[PDB]
Amino acid sequence: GPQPISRLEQCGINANDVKKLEEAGFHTVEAVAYAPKKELINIKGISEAKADKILAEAAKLVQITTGSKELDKLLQGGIETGSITEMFGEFRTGKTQICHTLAVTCQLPIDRGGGEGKAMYIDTEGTFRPERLLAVAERYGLSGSDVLDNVAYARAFNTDHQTQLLYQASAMMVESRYALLIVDSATALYRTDYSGRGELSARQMHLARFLRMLLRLADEFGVAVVITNQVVGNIIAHASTTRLYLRKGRGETRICKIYDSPCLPEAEAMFAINADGVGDAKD
Amino acid sequence: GPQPISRLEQCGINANDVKKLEEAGFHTVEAVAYAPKKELINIKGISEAKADKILAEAAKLVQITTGSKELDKLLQGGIETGSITEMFGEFRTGKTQICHTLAVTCQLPIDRGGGEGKAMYIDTEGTFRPERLLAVAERYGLSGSDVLDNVAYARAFNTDHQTQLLYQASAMMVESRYALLIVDSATALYRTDYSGRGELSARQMHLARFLRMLLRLADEFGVAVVITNQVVGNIIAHASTTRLYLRKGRGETRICKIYDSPCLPEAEAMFAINADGVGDAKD
Amino acid sequence: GPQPISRLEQCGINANDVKKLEEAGFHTVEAVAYAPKKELINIKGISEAKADKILAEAAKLVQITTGSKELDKLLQGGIETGSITEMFGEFRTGKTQICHTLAVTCQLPIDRGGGEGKAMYIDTEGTFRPERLLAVAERYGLSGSDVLDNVAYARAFNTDHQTQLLYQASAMMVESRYALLIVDSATALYRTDYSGRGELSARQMHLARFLRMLLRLADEFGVAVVITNQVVGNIIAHASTTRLYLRKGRGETRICKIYDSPCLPEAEAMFAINADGVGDAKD
Numbered sequence: 001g002p003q004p005i006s007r008l009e010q011c012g013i014n015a016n017d018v019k020k021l022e023e024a025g026f027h028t029v030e031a032v033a034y035a036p037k038k039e040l041i042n043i044k045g046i047s048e049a050k051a052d053k054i055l056a057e058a059a060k061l062v063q064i065t066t067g068s069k070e071l072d073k074l075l076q077g078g079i080e081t082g083s084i085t086e087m088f089g090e091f092r093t094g095k096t097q098i099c100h101t102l103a104v105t106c107q108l109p110i111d112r113g114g115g116e117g118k119a120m121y122i123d124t125e126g127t128f129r130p131e132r133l134l135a136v137a138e139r140y141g142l143s144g145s146d147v148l149d150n151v152a153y154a155r156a157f158n159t160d161h162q163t164q165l166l167y168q169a170s171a172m173m174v175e176s177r178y179a180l181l182i183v184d185s186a187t188a189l190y191r192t193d194y195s196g197r198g199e200l201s202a203r204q205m206h207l208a209r210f211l212r213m214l215l216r217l218a219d220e221f222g223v224a225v226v227i228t229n230q231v232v233g234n235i236i237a238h239a240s241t242t243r244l245y246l247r248k249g250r251g252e253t254r255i256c257k258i259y260d261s262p263c264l265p266e267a268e269a270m271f272a273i274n275a276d277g278v279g280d281a282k283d
Numbered sequence: 284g285p286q287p288i289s290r291l292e293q294c295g296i297n298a299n300d301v302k303k304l305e306e307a308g309f310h311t312v313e314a315v316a317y318a319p320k321k322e323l324i325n326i327k328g329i330s331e332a333k334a335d336k337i338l339a340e341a342a343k344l345v346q347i348t349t350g351s352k353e354l355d356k357l358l359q360g361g362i363e364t365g366s367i368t369e370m371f372g373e374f375r376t377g378k379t380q381i382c383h384t385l386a387v388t389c390q391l392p393i394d395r396g397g398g399e400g401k402a403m404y405i406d407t408e409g410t411f412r413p414e415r416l417l418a419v420a421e422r423y424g425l426s427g428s429d430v431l432d433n434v435a436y437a438r439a440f441n442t443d444h445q446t447q448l449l450y451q452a453s454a455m456m457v458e459s460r461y462a463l464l465i466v467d468s469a470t471a472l473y474r475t476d477y478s479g480r481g482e483l484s485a486r487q488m489h490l491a492r493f494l495r496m497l498l499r500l501a502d503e504f505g506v507a508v509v510i511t512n513q514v515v516g517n518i519i520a521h522a523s524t525t526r527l528y529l530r531k532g533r534g535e536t537r538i539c540k541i542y543d544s545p546c547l548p549e550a551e552a553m554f555a556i557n558a559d560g561v562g563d564a565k566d
Numbered sequence: 567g568p569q570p571i572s573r574l575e576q577c578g579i580n581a582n583d584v585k586k587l588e589e590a591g592f593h594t595v596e597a598v599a600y601a602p603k604k605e606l607i608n609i610k611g612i613s614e615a616k617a618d619k620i621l622a623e624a625a626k627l628v629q630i631t632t633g634s635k636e637l638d639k640l641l642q643g644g645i646e647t648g649s650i651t652e653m654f655g656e657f658r659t660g661k662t663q664i665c666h667t668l669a670v671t672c673q674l675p676i677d678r679g680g681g682e683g684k685a686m687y688i689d690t691e692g693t694f695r696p697e698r699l700l701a702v703a704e705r706y707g708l709s710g711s712d713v714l715d716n717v718a719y720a721r722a723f724n725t726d727h728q729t730q731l732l733y734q735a736s737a738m739m740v741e742s743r744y745a746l747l748i749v750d751s752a753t754a755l756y757r758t759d760y761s762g763r764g765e766l767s768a769r770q771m772h773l774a775r776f777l778r779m780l781l782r783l784a785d786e787f788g789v790a791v792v793i794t795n796q797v798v799g800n801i802i803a804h805a806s807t808t809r810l811y812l813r814k815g816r817g818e819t820r821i822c823k824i825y826d827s828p829c830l831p832e833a834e835a836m837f838a839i840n841a842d843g844v845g846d847a848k849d
Binding site for chain 3: 374375379380407408409410412414415440441442443444468471475476478479482515535
Binding site for chain 2: 091092096124125126127128129131132157158159160161185188192193195199232252
């Protein structure tokens, strides 16, 4: 399991540097331990000696239904909890709609295709609609009020705030059972904030660390990690376990394709976006 | 609510840098706080040390009827105040006419579908006509003189002046209740001023900051933000909540289509442009 | 009103740079003030430091009858003084004839549809005919000699000379009341002078500055600004308030159409070109 980074402070790292590591997004001794010097050195106010002391002392201690049956079959029954699933597609393909649907379906009983856990929606694009969550809840006969009470929401204004919310998510996810973490327009802040060309490596490093934190949180809490990508990077490939390509069919009916999964076939399924739901295509 | 940036000077930022931030368009501690270093560094006469001092001390503190029934039905009753609604369409489709109509309808009672608030028209294209406001006021039986007395008007000559007017708008909108802010040819000054190709990133940055200021003012005063775009940007998508495509039907009758809304359907409504009003199509 | 640029020199801009700004065509503190840095930097013999000093110190201080009744009805009574009215049409449609007629009608009493002011004809195409002015004066019973005495004429040899004449026009228009400024083949010199493709942005910038100077003079003196364009720029659309499309009807009778006006309908009116006058069609 995890080894929360608090224990690293008893090794004699000072607590301020541990706070800087938590701000960076390292929350376990496992997390600090299996990384090279440069990760800790790149943090502001950390020299090579402090990074070597951290690594040295760290080595001492150490299926959610989509609600579309065709899509569930495409996924062999739904998202695997504990792993990151990326859905990349054009704008208006229904990524946000799928997120809203899953934010409620996660709360469904496991026998009903849920995870019996609360949902987490981190929004960067303003598209969060509690009324859509209410619609999905009424679709499955779930209490809309309890759905909104079991979904904690916060809009990230920048990449630093986007990573900082993970610090609150890790501590908050310990007290209550969650099953779904949603990050909508996850890549948008890396394009709007970091727009220059010399700063590309900085946003790539921040994204890499963010993805590693996502995988860490997935393995730590056994929750589903959902991130949304606008396709107007090869780094996500090794990190994402299931890549879904979304494209528009005219009207409100969307085509979904699987474009990489080591376990799931590359395959396609047709679905629609209905007021209640993300739901099977009904010609 | 807001945390006006004035309090930041008591943290020990010098007042000249606070004046530079207000000129830049940051008016709350919230506004400075959730932005990265580069925003403050890019401002003229601000080094990285002053930006770091600002961010560090900042972290310590921190439905308007359109008067066309068919259009109201399309919007489910009218614009949501507190959010940006973008109407993109060809020239001569009636964007300016809609602006003139809304500038008066905003003052209508909330039961008559207004906001019971004053209007703000920032013009960049010269198309401001008080007589059109008088016609809309007499249409809804509002005093045309009081409508013009409750509409403050100023023509922006450039992008810098366009952003500078927001500083007067934020302080002026505190003393009186407003419900509608209109920015007509909002993108025209970014094309006339920034006409080169190497300066495209500069106009994109200025537009991004301007849009963020619009969102900030919308969340601060709970007013409706209306901006007009000529379609002869993808940045507006995450920022705009409702995208409307306007196209001409021959004669004076115009077709309206919804092209993105996370909550509103993609749908169309037919309307006309009448001397009194922007008003439903009447074959 | 205006704030003539002379006061800017007392702010401590050196006088040579003020002379360069006046040659460039900036004549008021308002004019220097509401423009971005690149306008002043692009002027020859002006560095970035002088432009920043100018903008900084500048911020411290800051219906004429057409004589065709049908056309008057089309315009709701005639040109609005203080604004630019553009008439775009093919060659030989009568743009120049309308200019000659207005050059005299402007001197008519206000009760007769005039402005009771002198006329200004800036010619670039050689088509200036004092005898046409005499014919219009005798039609409406105005003294032809006094009409020629109230019309100041000058032929622009190039785009730079065309803009330079505005410097003499601004100072000369202060001593006497004028009501009409005519620029005939206003776009021809930007085609004959700037004929290359790499120099397109230069002529577009010069035209933009020229149009801004026109708007400045219009707001300063409350005169009508008339420019003629041969259609064998999109920038003029936002700047021009009323666009009129002129096309030939065979013989000497011309069709006029309104192609944009926020206040005037899209509509057409038939008129003729008569020896005395630009005058209504009389089948």
